A paper describes a structure:
Human mitochondrial nuclease EXOG (hEXOG) is important for mtDNA integrity. hEXOG depletion selectively increases lesions in mtDNA, but has no effect on chromosomal DNA. Human EXOG shares sequence homology with members of ββα-Me nuclease family, which contains nonspecific endonucleases. The catalytic Core domain of hEXOG is identical to EndoG, but its C-terminal extension forms a unique Wing domain that converts the enzyme from a nonspecific endonuclease into a DNA-geometry-specific exonuclease. Conversely, in mitochondrial LP-BER, the nuclease reaction occurs before DNA synthesis: hEXOG processes the 5′-end of DNA downstream of the lesion, generating an optimal substrate for DNA synthesis catalysed by Pol γ.
The nuclease-deficient variant, hEXOG–H140A, was refolded and purified similarly to wild type and used for co-crystallization with a 10 bp DNA. Successful crystallization experiments were performed at enzyme concentrations greatly exceeding the Kd value for the weaker DNA-binding site of the hEXOG dimer as determined by ITC; consequently, DNA occupied both active sites. Both DNA duplexes are oriented such that the 5′-P end of the substrate is proximal and the 5′-OH end is distal to the active site. However, the two Wing domains undergo different conformational changes from their positions in the apo structure: one rotates only 3°, whereas the other rotates 35° away from the DNA. Consequently, upon DNA binding, hEXOG becomes asymmetrical where one active site remains in the ‘closed' configuration and the other becomes ‘open'. The dsDNA is bound to each positively charged active site cleft; the substrate strand interacts primarily with the Core domain and the complementary strand with the Wing domain, explaining why the Wing domain of hEXOG increases specificity for dsDNA. In the closed active site, the complementary strand interacts with Wing residues R314, R315, R320, R324 and K327, with R324 forming a bipartite interaction with the +3 nt DNA backbone at distances of 3.1 and 3.4 Å; R315 and K327 are, respectively, 4.3 and 6.7 Å from the +2 nt DNA backbone. In the open active site, the complementary DNA strand lacks several interactions, because the bipartite distances to R324 are increased threefold (to 9.4 and 9.8 Å), and R315 and K327 are similarly displaced (10.2 and 16.4 Å, respectively) from the +2 nt backbone. The nature of Mg2+ was confirmed by Mn2+ substitution and single-wavelength anomalous dispersion data.
Numbering used by the authors:
A (entry chain A): 60 to 356
B (entry chain B): 60 to 357
Write the structure that this text describes.
DNA sequence: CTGACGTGC
DNA sequence: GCACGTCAG
DNA sequence: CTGACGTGC
DNA sequence: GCACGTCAG
């Protein structure tokens, strides 16, 4: 009728498809509401290198509602990708699209480089055991209850564009053994506080029911999912075991080997590795000698 | 590809149409993001009465994401309609739908019955001078700059369902003189804090540019409105003048005549006027003597 | 006009 | 616990 | 792997 | 001020 003569207000929440992920953008907060990615063992292999990528505004987002690097730099918060670059080694285009700020939230540096990175590495590990893995990640601004029962949502906004800093990050993991497998699906929802987290807390300490997360986020995840199909807790069908300090430090050092462009850096890697722990079994020396061998050329 | 194998997440932000308004619901905050209404002379006349209406959850909203009266009662916040009941005198069906909690936000009681009430009455007043008036209303949670330069958004959530309490309320007013007139349209955008305001601040003190409001709300208002055509500031073409204390009080006293159930309550309405040294006009006096004659036969 | 609150089925 | 009469800004 | 930071034109 | 080498979790 005449009510829509000049159109309904636009919220800009429609799904946006990229090479290897999709997202819904929150124009008021300058961050994604959710970012959906599909992981398989083929996608996490390849020569795509993030050194040739740089954060930038998503051109498909109206500049009025876009975040800009000026909002993050100097803010005290790191640019935290929801769809990580590590899941897009198969395509330079796919990886570069993860560096769109439409995929980024203000994230604690330690959290970004530590616990959240470890969760991301677990999702990649799942592809060694499940043919297909679906992951939805996004930010949350949860309330905190005072001693008198009053509940308050408090979160910082940074930059000229007031980019919302989430209090928590969520991750919903859906895994299917194989296309023909009559085995149940594995499902897990996790909510992590946007702060430094050590190596003591297991991932199950941050596990929540999907229903609780849907009430906290206002989102319905995987709506096409058959509610009577056998779905099991991913931490019962699998391990939900993140890497401990020793494995984590070794994996970082191994990745640093493959990128060592000089021999002097190769020595620094070993010095950092060896102190204050770690003798590499089964595997860091085999790749250390190989890179040392080639670099002599 | 297999990316959408089980469907994309659902935000539930699609426009929902009712008899005389439309809204987009915020499932995470349990309040509407925006509520659009169209006002005309005909729509604000009629016999529809609030006494036949009750606040209830919107049946079209998934209960998982719905607010409930239990969230509001005893919270210290009033239920504040975005599309007001006063704009739906023409239809009891349309008025009942404004009491769906999908149209409601937690609102300061004084602001709700005072300053915001007066802005709504100005929107109805505009139909005396414009054939058609469109109004978009909704909540805002704006940041506050702290002493250390940090910018913090901070708002309360109330009830078992964590209904978000907005820090501000916005209203965008679009007015067209006539369907055939070549006169530019009149546009105004306003942001009012969710607190008691009083009669000192003029409405223009709360005016903002449409682009500022869109930047703050993350919404694009009236996307089919030709913004490159000449559009006039409504406070320049019109008055943007809310009722002052005397007019407001006299208008409330007039409405209260109709609802007085006793001769003692009707006379107190006249007493509070004269005790405030407000002079009753003729329509009030005539309406007052009519009701008084009819109440002394109880 | 805008609302909440106490009473009684 | 709602429906409804009462009371306030 | 995840990132920021210091330096140079 | 960005581009890029260097550095840190
Ligand atoms: Mn990250
Ligand atoms: Mn109201």
């Amino acid at each position: 009728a005449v009510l829509e003569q000049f159109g309904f207000p636009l919220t800009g929440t429609e799904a946006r498809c990229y090479t290897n992920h999709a997202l819904s953008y929150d124009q008021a907060k300058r961050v994604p509401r959710w970012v959906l990615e599909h992981i398989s063992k083929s996608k996490i292999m390849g020569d795509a290198d993030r050194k040739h990528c740089k954060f930038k505004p998503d051109p498909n987002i109206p500049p009025t509602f876009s975040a800009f690097n000026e909002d993050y730099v100097g803010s005290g918060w790191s640019r935290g990708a929801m769809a990580p670059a590590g899941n897009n080694k198969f395509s330079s285009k796919a990886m570069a699209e993860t560096f769109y700020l439409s995929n980024i939230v203000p994230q604690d540096f330690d959290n970004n480089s530590g616990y959240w990175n470890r969760i991301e590495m677990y999702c990649r590990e799942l592809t060694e055991r499940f043919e297909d893995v679906w992951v939805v990640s996004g930010p949350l601004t949860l309330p905190q209850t005072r001693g008198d029962g009053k509940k308050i949502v408090s979160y910082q906004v940074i930059g000229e564009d007031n980019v919302a800093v989430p209090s928590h990050l969520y991750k919903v993991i859906l895994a299917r053994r194989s296309s023909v497998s009559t085995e149940p699906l594995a499902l897990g929802a996790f909510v992590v506080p946007n702060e430094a987290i050590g190596f003591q807390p297991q991932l199950t300490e941050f596990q929540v029911s999907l229903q609780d997360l849907e009430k906290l986020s206002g989102l319905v995840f995987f709506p096409h999912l058959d509610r009577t199909s056998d779905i099991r807790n991913i931490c019962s069908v699998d391990t939900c075991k993140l890497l401990d300090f020793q494995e984590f430090t070794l994996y970082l050092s191994t990745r640093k080997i493959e990128g060592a462009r000089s021999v002097l850096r190769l020595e620094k890697i070993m010095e950092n590795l060896k102190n204050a722990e770690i003798e590499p079994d089964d595997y860091f020396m085999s790749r250390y000698e190989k890179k040392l061998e080639e670099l002599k050329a």
